[PDB]
Amino acid sequence: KRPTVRPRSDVTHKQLSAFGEYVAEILPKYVQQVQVSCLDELEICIHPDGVIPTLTFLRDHTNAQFKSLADLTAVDVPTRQNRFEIVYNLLSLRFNSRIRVKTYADELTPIDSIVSVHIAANWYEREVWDMFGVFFFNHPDLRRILTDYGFEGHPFRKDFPLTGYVELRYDDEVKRVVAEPVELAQEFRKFDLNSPWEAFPAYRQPP
């Protein structure tokens, strides 16, 4: 049809909408929203209390064998009341399909670890805790994973400075690698590349 536009199919969209209604009506106690994007990606937004029940169902149920935990992520949206949005991306090999499950958490409102459901989360949850500060209940071994051993802070938070507060160098006087406040020969340049004109009228938030 149009060479430079992605070809879209409605069969997948209709199947995903049907399954979204299916899951929503099977778990009314936890499901707070359901949506299928124009990319055809079913997305179920749940209450944080329903994480373990939802994942156990989506893994064990015959009509939803989402047995592979492809991803466990957190997105930081500072404005909203609950800063962190926890995203589980799951794959069902029996039905050759993918689903996404979302919940929310705050710096002081932990989430239930799903290591019982999926063991793949054992390290993804550790990474989320290390980089965002989201705590997880009933985790076998929750601790830092990616950051330095004595590192203080949660880098992936948007309020964290890009270059942090500390840096390392070797100090001959003490014969060690010492941590000191960061000083840069040239500071990071934050180019303002935002135009005044809106590019997409379809995403115009009402005034």
Partner: protein
Amino acid sequence: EEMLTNNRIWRNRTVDIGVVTAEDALNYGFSGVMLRGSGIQWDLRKTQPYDVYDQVEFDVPIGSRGDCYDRYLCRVEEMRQSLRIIEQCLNKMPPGEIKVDDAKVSPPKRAEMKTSMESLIHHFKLYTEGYQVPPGATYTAIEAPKGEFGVYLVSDGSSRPYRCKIKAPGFAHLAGLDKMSKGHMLADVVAIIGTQDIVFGEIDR
């Protein structure tokens, strides 16, 4: 293959080392050769094809014992299947352009940039501010050589990505190293590390 496949020393040093069952692989989140050497029939190139992979013929190797030896055979066979795909690519290469003819997304040819006002403006803006991506979120996965390489990308409508989580196939594999090393010696652990196929650039990000 003449050097390694049938060598009794290699067979003793790899066979039955780090055996992983299909269910444990799925539940630990293994992908690619780690799944396929344990009997699971999965391969994104076949099941969720991307680009023109649906236009080429190849066979997905499958293991039976789920050990280091089966995974090594799987990789050696995947190399041959990649040759098989490469032949078809070399023979079917179509003629045409190479980047989407949409100067609001891909930069225009320099010859046009040096002649046309619209192309010059679009080149300037593409290499200064970049193209804006409409708001949304996607998860895209491919059968990368090490497994399923994924990207969960969140765009806030601007020209800079809001979030970009990288699903490195080795991150889930290295987590199962403790499981696979049970009942094995230090030399066996060394053998196990190679089969997982780990580059730490993707693991650490």
